[PDB]
């Protein structure tokens, strides 16, 4: 997260870290056994780390649970990034508590101009690299469909939306992929892609979670 702030320990209790001997993506806890992340975050042998703040120090509220199943959307395309969503099933159910909690799915799609909370452990610089120990947060608005498409001609599908600041300086970045965009207490987006980070006229691009709610519930019911 570039241009954000230190969230505060366990203030985003649905935020998880996906770990392969290092943090590589975020994710969102949607019930005690399932996490939503980005399809491009898929890898075998993932450990899900819940209750984290400082990802490099054991602070006492963590649960580390292996992924037992990873289910990428059937129509994911790694070239276009269309349908960039994955569901991870935990080998055992997380113990839900004040620091490990689910985020609700949407009942409708969000609107342009709605301020959302984006979070993660990704890069905090728009040029170069600085990776935080603790979770970072950013408030950013959903952009209009027309502004999103203007920013990325030919690349925005009906399964994506833009959020952020066209002047630059405030955005998600590498290491934030798969993590949440929460608006009005619902999970509306998944960090997906952008051109650079926090660049002028290059807002963040997010998977539009409201298009997938039936698929998510059906996948959970059958796996």
């Amino acid at each position: 997260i570039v241009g954000g702030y230190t969230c505060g320990a366990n203030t985003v209790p649905y935020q998880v870290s996906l770990n392969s001997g290092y943090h590589f993506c975020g994710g969102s806890l949607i019930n005690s056994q399932w996490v939503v992340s980005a399809a491009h975050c898929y890898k075998s042998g993932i450990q899900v780390r819940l209750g984290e703040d400082n990802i490099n120090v054991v602070e006492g509220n963590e649960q580390f649970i292996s992924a037992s199943k990873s289910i990428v959307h059937p129509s994911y395309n790694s070239n276009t990034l269309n349908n960039d969503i994955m569901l991870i099933k935990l080998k055992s159910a997380a113990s839900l508590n004040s620091r490990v909690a689910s985020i609700s799915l949407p009942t409708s799609c969000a609107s342009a101009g709605t301020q959302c909370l984006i979070s993660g452990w990704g890069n905090t610089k728009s040029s170069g690299t600085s990776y935080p120990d603790v979770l970072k947060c950013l408030k950013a608005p959903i952009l209009s469909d027309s502004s999103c498409k203007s920013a990325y001609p030919g690349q925005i599908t009906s399964n994506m939306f833009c959020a952020g600041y066209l002047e630059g300086g405030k955005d998600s970045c590498q290491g934030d992929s798969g993590g949440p965009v929460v608006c009005s207490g619902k999970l509306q987006g998944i960090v997906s892609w952008g051109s650079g980070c926090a660049q002028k006229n290059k807002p963040g691009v997010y998977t539009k979670v409201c298009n997938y709610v039936s698929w998510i519930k059906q996948t959970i019911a059958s796996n």
């Binding site: 491009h40 890069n123 590498q174 051109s195």
Partner: peptide
């Protein structure tokens, strides 16, 4: 299109 995995999408 640059995905937002750490350290990068291409680096893995």
């Amino acid at each position: 299109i640059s995905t937002r995995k750490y350290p990068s999408d291409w680096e893995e």
